[PDB]
Amino acid sequence: GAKIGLFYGTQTGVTQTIAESIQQEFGGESIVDLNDIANADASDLNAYDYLIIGCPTWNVGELQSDWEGIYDDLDSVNFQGKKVAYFGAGDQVGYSDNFQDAMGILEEKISSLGSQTVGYWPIEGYDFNESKAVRNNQFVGLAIDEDNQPDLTKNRIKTWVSQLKSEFGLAL
Amino acid sequence: GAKIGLFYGTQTGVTQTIAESIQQEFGGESIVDLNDIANADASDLNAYDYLIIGCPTWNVGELQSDWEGIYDDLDSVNFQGKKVAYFGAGDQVGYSDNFQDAMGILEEKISSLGSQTVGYWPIEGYDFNESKAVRNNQFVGLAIDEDNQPDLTKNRIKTWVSQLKSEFGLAL
Numbered sequence: 226g227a228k229i230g231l232f233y234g235t236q237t238g239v240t241q242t243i244a245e246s247i248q249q250e251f252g253g254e255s256i257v258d259l260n261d262i263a264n265a266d267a268s269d270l271n272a273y274d275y276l277i278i279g280c281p282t283w284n285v286g287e288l289q290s291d292w293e294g295i296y297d298d299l300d301s302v303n304f305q306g307k308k309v310a311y312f313g314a315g316d317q318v319g320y321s322d323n324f325q326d327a328m329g330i331l332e333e334k335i336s337s338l339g340s341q342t343v344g345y346w347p348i349e350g351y352d353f354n355e356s357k358a359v360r361n362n363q364f365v366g367l368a369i370d371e372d373n374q375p376d377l378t379k380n381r382i383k384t385w386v387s388q389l390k391s392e393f394g395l396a397l
Numbered sequence: 398g399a400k401i402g403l404f405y406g407t408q409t410g411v412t413q414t415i416a417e418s419i420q421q422e423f424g425g426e427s428i429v430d431l432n433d434i435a436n437a438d439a440s441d442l443n444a445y446d447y448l449i450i451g452c453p454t455w456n457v458g459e460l461q462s463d464w465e466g467i468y469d470d471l472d473s474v475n476f477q478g479k480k481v482a483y484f485g486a487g488d489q490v491g492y493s494d495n496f497q498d499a500m501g502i503l504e505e506k507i508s509s510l511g512s513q514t515v516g517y518w519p520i521e522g523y524d525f526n527e528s529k530a531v532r533n534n535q536f537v538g539l540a541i542d543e544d545n546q547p548d549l550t551k552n553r554i555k556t557w558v559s560q561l562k563s564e565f566g567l568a569l
Contacts, residue, residue, distance in 0.1 A: 329532040329533065330532065330533045332532065333517075333532040333533045333534075333535055334533070336514060336517070337517040337535055339564070341513040342508060342514070345505075345508070345509040357532045357533060358532070360501040360502065360504065360505040360529045360530070360532075361501065361502045361505045361506070361529060362505075363505055363509055392511070
C-alpha cells in the first residue's frame with residue numbers, strides 16, 4: 226500500500242478535513258493512506274514505516290473517545306524504527322491552558338514505545354498559555370485552530386508537509 | 398573510541414558523580430566515554446552514534462551555564478540516526494514547579510534536530526507539580542534527587558542503564 230499511514234479520530238469533522246488536506250499536500254491517496262481509527266485495530270499501525278497521528282483536544286483531561294479505546298493496545302505495536310508525526314485541531318483561546326494536550330499525550334506514549342518523533346512545529350505563530358505538546362517552544366506536531374486562525378490552515382498544512390517529506394526521508 | 402558518548406555539565410559535582418555511576422553501570426570507560434561539556438565543542442557529539450546528555454536544573458528559567466554556551470551550536474551537529482538519552486540532578490521539593498526542566502529544554506531541541514529520544518522514565522517514583530521533561534507521566538530521562546531521595550539513586554541508575562542497553566540496541 227501507501228508509504229505513509231494516517232490514522233485519525235474525528236468528533237466534529239475538523240480532524241477529518243485536516244487529514245484529507247494533509248493527504249492532498251503529500252500527493253494524494255497514492256502517497257498517504259487515510260485510516261479512521263474507529264474502524265481499525267492497533268496492529269494496523271504495523272503496516273507502515275511512516276505514520277501520522279491525528280487527534281483533537283476538545284474537552285480537557287480527555288482523549289478523543291476512539292483513541293482512548295486503542296490507547297491501551299499500542300503496547301502491542303512494534304514501533305521500533307518507525308517515524309511518527311502528529312497533528313490536531315484545537316481552540317487556543319477557549320482552551321488556552323490545554324491547547325493540543327492530546328498531541329502531547331499520544332506522542333509521549335508512542336515515542337516511548339520506540340518510535341522517532343518527526344515534524345516538530347514552532348509555537349510562535351500561536352497565542353496560548355500551556356500545552357502538553359510543548360516542552361519549550363515547539364509543538365510535537367501541527368496545531369490547527371479553525372476557530373481562531375482559519376486563514377492560516379492551508380499554508381500551515383502545506384509547509385508542514387514539505388517539512389515532513391524531508392524528515393520522513395521521502396523528498397528528492 | 399567508546400560506543401556511547403556521555404556529555405555533562407556540572408555545577409555542584411552531583412552531575413559528575415551521577416555521570417561516573419552511569420559509566421560504571423554500563424561497564425566502565427570501555428563502553429562509555431565521559432566528556433565534560435565545558436571542554437568540548439558541539440562537533441564532538443558527531444563522534445558517537447549513542448549519546449547521553451547530563452544537565453542539572455538548579456535555578457529555574459536557566460540552563461546550566463556551560464550548556465547555554467553550546468546550545469546555539471547544536472544546529473551544526475548531525476543528529477540524524479543518533480539515539481540520545483538524558484539525565485539530571487534536581488530538588489523536587491525546593492523546585493516542585495520546575496523539576497528537571499533543563500532535561501525538557503535540551504531534549505526538545507536535540508530531538509527536533511533529528512535524533513531519537515530513548516530512555517523514558519516513570520514519574521510515579523517522585524512527588525512534584527510540574528516539569529518541562531514530562532508531557533504526561535514519563536520524564537524524557539533519569540531524574541536524580543540527591544537532596545530528597547538519595548537512597549534510591551543507585552538502583553535508579555542501575556535500572557535505567559539496563560533499560561538503555563536494550564533501547565540503544567547494545568544488550569545481548
